[PDB]
Nucleic acid binder design. Sequence first.
RNA 1: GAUAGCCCCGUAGAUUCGUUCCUAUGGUUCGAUCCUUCCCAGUAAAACGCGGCGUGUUCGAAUUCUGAUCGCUUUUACGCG
RNA 2: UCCAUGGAUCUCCGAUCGGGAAACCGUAUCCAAGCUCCGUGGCUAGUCUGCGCUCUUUGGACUUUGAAAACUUAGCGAACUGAAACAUCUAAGUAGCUAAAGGAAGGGAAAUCAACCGAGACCCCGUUAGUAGCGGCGAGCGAGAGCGGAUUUGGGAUUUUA
Lengths: 133, 26, 99, 51
Amino acid sequence: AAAAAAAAAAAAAAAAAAAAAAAAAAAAAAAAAAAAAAAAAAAAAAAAAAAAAAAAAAAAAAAAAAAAAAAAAAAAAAAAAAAAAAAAAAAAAAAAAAAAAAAAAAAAAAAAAAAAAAAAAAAAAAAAAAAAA
Amino acid sequence: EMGAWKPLGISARRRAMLRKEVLTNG
Amino acid sequence: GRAKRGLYAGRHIQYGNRVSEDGGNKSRRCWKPNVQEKRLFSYIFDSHIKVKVTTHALRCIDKAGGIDEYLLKTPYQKMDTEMGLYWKTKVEARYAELG
Amino acid sequence: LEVILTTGIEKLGKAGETVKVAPGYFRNHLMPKLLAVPNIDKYAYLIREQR
RNA sequence: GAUAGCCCCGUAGAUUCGUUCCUAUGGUUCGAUCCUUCCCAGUAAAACGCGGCGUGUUCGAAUUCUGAUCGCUUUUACGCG
RNA sequence: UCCAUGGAUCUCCGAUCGGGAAACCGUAUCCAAGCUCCGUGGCUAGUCUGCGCUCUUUGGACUUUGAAAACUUAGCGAACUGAAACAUCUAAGUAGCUAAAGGAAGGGAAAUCAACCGAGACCCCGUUAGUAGCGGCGAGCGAGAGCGGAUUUGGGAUUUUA
């Protein structure tokens, strides 16, 4: 897989890297404790999204980014900053079912990280997190 | 916005200059 | 001039007249800012820390919520006292330790 | 000013309450005696976790 | 050896001199964004004293730089107006 | 001889390792890996077989300090003199002193002007004018915006989103 994605873009071919990293997402490498640190460096966080936005949902689904509530703040920030509110609330409900940051506390936790204003327009996905999501 | 929003978006002088350029086309 | 070692909150002595009440004489003088060497309490060290603050700076540390959570502010605005820059970077690195 | 109490004390509210107090009476005393804390959220957030 | 275009040295100039048209490429590309850093404020005013304003400072001084004190300003209705 | 290039040597103070009465007096470490050098152990002497030193040099990291005329920007900040004497005022934010900075520095793209019309960062040069304003309303101090030239520049954070 590394050799194939190297063929895709070490030669720096853009959509080739895109489809090949989607193929690695489909390869679904481990994400247990450090392989997830490898996978984010394979889906990053936020930024362009698009093909990455798939492996974002996917690396969230591998087990979860629940490795930390803090890294989970990083992941929710990525989802929000990719301006993908749909995938954002999706992965939100995903971790929620998947043992999230204890919504009976994660509610106020998101409240505080929102008063931090770091992830701002995801106040919409927060209205979801408070009404349905 | 929900409060007093971003002032008007653009620096009023960098809106007047642009409206000048625009209307310069007619 | 002593701010180079004090936490004077940018407060700076000012040299100007003093005007008499009736005759209108002008005789030079200065205005020195309030200065009350104190023993603040820093929740990082949890150990008293003795510095020469104004009262402007005192009230500011108060509002911001203590010497610690005041230190974590603009270095390019504390940039008057390089020893203050040092205070800030040290305390921030010790919070890093506690992260 | 106001603070939050890490323990109940006389002439003052119960343990887990937030209370308005005097500035010196907080800084010189009750800050180092470690009976109350400022209500910046970094500490507000640790109170309800000590409880 | 006296006042030189043609006595002399240079001088004009011509020239020689070192003055643009040009690098791929592996090493692997943290694989060209498979990264993201701290914001409502002791803040604007205010009173007094000062002063910079080319306008003695609020007997009339308008904005204003600063010392001590004190200190303001705002998202929410049949999922929508 | 001489020119150009490039190489050799290159005493001292200023001075910056320590002292200093300027031009003189005192002086590296740590660690690797280098042959030589100097004993040490081997007793098994087997490249007879091996350890641990040194002076040194390489090659690093420890080991460490820079100055100017005017200009600029600030911190201070005066009197003589003027008023026909003089205390508010002028001299003057000048003289001078100190600190910091670069070859310029600053200043800079509107919580700005103007007046219901308009303008459009910054400076610098004419002009408005010694006008208006200030001032024991005395002596003197004395413009802004606007018009003419020099300049010619805005850029970024905004992000319209898949």
